[PDB]
Each structure stands twice: as C-alpha cells, then as structure tokens.
Design a protein around this ligand. Sequence first.
Ligand SMILES: C[C@@H]1O[C@H](O)[C@@H](O)[C@H](O)[C@@H]1O
Ligand SMILES: C[C@@H]1O[C@H](O)[C@@H](O)[C@H](O)[C@@H]1O
Ligand SMILES: C[C@@H]1O[C@H](O)[C@@H](O)[C@H](O)[C@@H]1O
Ligand SMILES: C[C@@H]1O[C@H](O)[C@@H](O)[C@H](O)[C@@H]1O
Ligand SMILES: C[C@@H]1O[C@H](O)[C@@H](O)[C@H](O)[C@@H]1O
Ligand SMILES: [Mg+2]
Length: 490
Amino acid sequence: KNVTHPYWAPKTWKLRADDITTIMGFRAKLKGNLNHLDRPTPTVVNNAFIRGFLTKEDVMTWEVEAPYEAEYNIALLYTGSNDILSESTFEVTSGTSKIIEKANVKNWDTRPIVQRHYLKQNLLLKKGINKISFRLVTFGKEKTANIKPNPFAFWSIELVRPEALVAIKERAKEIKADLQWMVDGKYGLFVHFSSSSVPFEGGLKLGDQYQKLVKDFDVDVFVEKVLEIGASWVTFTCAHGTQHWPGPSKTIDSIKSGFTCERDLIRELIDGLGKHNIRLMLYYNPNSGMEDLYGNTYGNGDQPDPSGYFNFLEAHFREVSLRYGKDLASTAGYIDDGGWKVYQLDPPWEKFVKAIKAGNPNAPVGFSQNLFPNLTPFSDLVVSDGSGRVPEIQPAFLFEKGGQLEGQYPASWFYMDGWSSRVKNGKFTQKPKFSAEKYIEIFKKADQVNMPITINLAMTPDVTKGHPIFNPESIEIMKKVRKAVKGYLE
Ligand SMILES: C[C@@H]1O[C@H](O)[C@@H](O)[C@H](O)[C@@H]1O
Ligand SMILES: C[C@@H]1O[C@H](O)[C@@H](O)[C@H](O)[C@@H]1O
Ligand SMILES: C[C@@H]1O[C@H](O)[C@@H](O)[C@H](O)[C@@H]1O
Ligand SMILES: C[C@@H]1O[C@H](O)[C@@H](O)[C@H](O)[C@@H]1O
Ligand SMILES: C[C@@H]1O[C@H](O)[C@@H](O)[C@H](O)[C@@H]1O
Ligand SMILES: [Mg+2]
C-alpha cells in the first residue's frame, strides 16, 4: 500500500567503494507489515521512516551494486521505545553472509533521537548485484501525553569498507575547523532575514520585494545594535523561504534570474561588522523555494538524477567561499534540514565541505542535523533547531570515540522571542520567552562549559533608521546578558 513517485521508488544503488554510501529505507523492497508515509511527488518527505517490524516476515530488501568483492561495514540508523529496543535483534543478510546483533538502547536524554549503530561484524558483498535484507528476529513491546506510540522506526542503512572509513576519518581530522574563536566569543546573534517576513512599515513580504529591501538595508543601524548586545558573530539568513540571495552570484544567476541583488550586502555586512571584529556566518536553506530555482532535486525526465542539483550546491558553496575568502567566517554556519532533507539524497558531503572551505580553510561547517546523529565525519558543529527552549547540554560521551556525535563540537541555536519577525501594526507580537535572569543563567552555563550560543532575536526585514529593528524588550535582556557575561566582573 506504500506509495513512491518514481524518483523515490526502490532501485538498485551503486556503491561508492571509497566512500560512505547511504541508502534510505524506502529504497528497499518492503514485505509484510512494513510501511512508510506516501511520497507521491518529486518533493522530499521528511517523515521517511519504515515502521511495522512486528514479525519475522516483516523484511526489507535493498539491491546494491558493488564494484568488486569486498567486506563492507554496516551502520543502521533507527529510533524507537527503549522498551522495544532492549529486546530487538537485528538480522542483516546478503548471499551467505549474515549479521545478528541486539539493538542499542538510547542512554542519553537529549538529541540525537535517531541513533547510528555500527554493526560489529562486517558484511561480505560479491561483485555486482547484491540483495541485502534487514529484519528483526526478536521483538519487544512498549510498557507503562502517553498516547502516541513509539515503534521501531528504521531510517537508513550505511555501507563503507572498513579501510575506506579509516582513510575518510583521517581526512576529516586534517581539515577539522579550529573553533577557539567561537568559544572565546561566547555568543553570537542569529538574524533571520526571512522571505516570509512583513516590514515594520507594512506592505509586501520580504520575498516579494527582496531586492528593494536589500538596497535600502541600513548596515550602520544594524551593526550598532549587534555591537550593543556584545555579539561576537552574526549568522545571517540567506535563502530563508525562497532562494533569494543578498548579493551577486554567477552560480544562481546561471540557473535562473531574479534571485540575486546588484548590491553586495554580504560584503557590506562583513566590512561593517569587521570594524568591531565581529564575524559573519551564513545560514543557507538548500530546499525552500528550490523548485522555483533549480526545480526538482532529482531533475526532470523519467529516471531520478541528482548530479545537476549536487553540482549546483557545490559550485554555489565554492563561489561564495572564494568570493569573500577569509573575510567571511563561513558560507555554511547553518545549512537547514541537512538531516530531514539533504541526507535523503545520499549527497557528496565531502565535496560540499571542500567547497565551503575553499576560500577559508578554517570555515566551520554547520549542517543542521535535526534530531539525527552526526551526518558526516566532515562536520564541525552540532547544529539543530533549539526553538525557544532552554539549551540542552549533550553529555560528554556522545563526543567520544564511537559516539553518536564524534568529531562534532557542542553548540546551541535558539531564539529569544521567535525566528521570523511577526510585526503587525507597528508592534512586536513575539515577546521573550523567559525573564532576564533566566537568560543570564543560560549564557553563564554555556560559557562555563565552552559551548557557543547563537541566539535569534526576531528582526524587521526593513532595516532603517525609522523604527526599532529588534524588539526593545529583547535588546534590553541581551544588554543584561552582556553585562553579566562579557562585562567587568568582580
Ligand atoms: C545509484 C544511486 O542512484 C541515486 O539516484 C543517487 O542518489 C545515488 O547517489 C546513486 O547515484
Ligand atoms: C524556510 C523554512 O525552513 C524550515 O526548515 C521549513 O520547515 C519551513 O517551512 C520553511 O521552509
Ligand atoms: C515522471 C516524473 O513526473 C513528474 O511529474 C515530473 O516532475 C518529474 O520530473 C518526472 O517527469
Ligand atoms: C573570519 C575568519 O573566520 C575563520 O573561521 C576564523 O577561524 C578566523 O579566525 C577568522 O576570524
Ligand atoms: C534556524 C531555524 O531553522 C529551522 O529549521 C526553521 O524551521 C526555522 O524557521 C529557523 O530558520
Ligand atoms: Mg567559556
């Protein structure tokens, strides 16, 4: 009863013998109870999990193509009730090769919710077409809003020759970013220049008058507020809701006109913030409005092909990174939905990372991993949407060898009042979530454990002298935060 548009349907997967190959569960043939949410169009569907592993007949089968006979290390990504996991046994088969292994219980209280399980024994694969099957052979049950169930939910399988993994990890280690400047700066400002946002003075949402509002953006007004709250960096939102880009881009323009600006606002933000040694990183969203820029990520025509889209992302990262060089701290401080959306295309993470660092070899890579474990060994920062909640403190063993987050460094991304400003009738509708004293404790804790915080204060897309661009109550709180954390202490 499961539905997949041809671009999402099961197909034979080419193994990349020198790389980590990832294959979503819905690329397997499913039998028995196994099911997933419908995927009826070329557009990615976040909720990709396979559910219904209830009996020994509930089995999924991929078809993969190896270039030569070799042993492959298998990782599984899954989630579910610890009650269910504590009694689930996995079985991975191909040819005569068979792996049997108990599931791992999630013994941390934080994200990641999905865990990556490296199976101890390797799977031998013959040259050419191999069928690989996954099923459970022992089963648990949930025990005592406790309404929604938490079944075993399979996300993906990952295949990598053990020798390729050592070499991959070696290279990741050699280009790992040095984040001391973020720890020393303690916190920065997330600013959403959001295409859905309506200006303080009313009128068209930023998305429908993007170039005009970029041309009228008052950098000096913006920098003085950033400076006043003591931010050490700014993460600035490119392509939030549409693919509009606040500066020149040969890469974007060669796909489709109308998204770029004559004014190089990124450069002016660099220079304006640079006068006070405040650094700039870029948020970028590779999916929102992408159907109006590139089109379907898997292209047109009868069979899915992501190389055009991959080449766009790589050429875009590369052009931005080289355009600004070391003046731009990162063209990829926050790449939205790396977990929910980007991961589902089995993308070439390393090529993206090399593009990101081409102009700035220490540029931190921050793919948003959502509730998922580390997306690629070439990550630098833990990144996900903290909403307006108190920042979680992930326990240290997550970062040790074998850990879910190994190679990453802890970091928090959350908002004081909201993400996108919702100003209506000259009044901010989004108030700070907590008292000033609670934010002070939050930043003091982040500082004591050397975890950078990037806090969003909803900003009016029309940045001018005529009106507060941030909520004055929010500014007042951050001024008290600055005093308690960055001010003269005694
Ligand atoms: C054979 C596989 O086909 C898919 O469409 C791609 O997304 C994979 O990266 C690989 O090329
Ligand atoms: C730009 C925004 O990014 C988020 O990740 C999405 O979930 C929103 O709906 C919107 O697309
Ligand atoms: C067969 C598929 O149908 C869809 O409607 C199209 O958007 C795809 O690109 C492809 O042509
Ligand atoms: C702007 C540059 O960003 C890089 O990521 C940093 O490592 C450098 O110290 C410099 O500040
Ligand atoms: C940083 C946040 O990322 C999330 O994925 C989005 O849904 C929010 O709008 C915001 O942009
Ligand atoms: Mg510190």
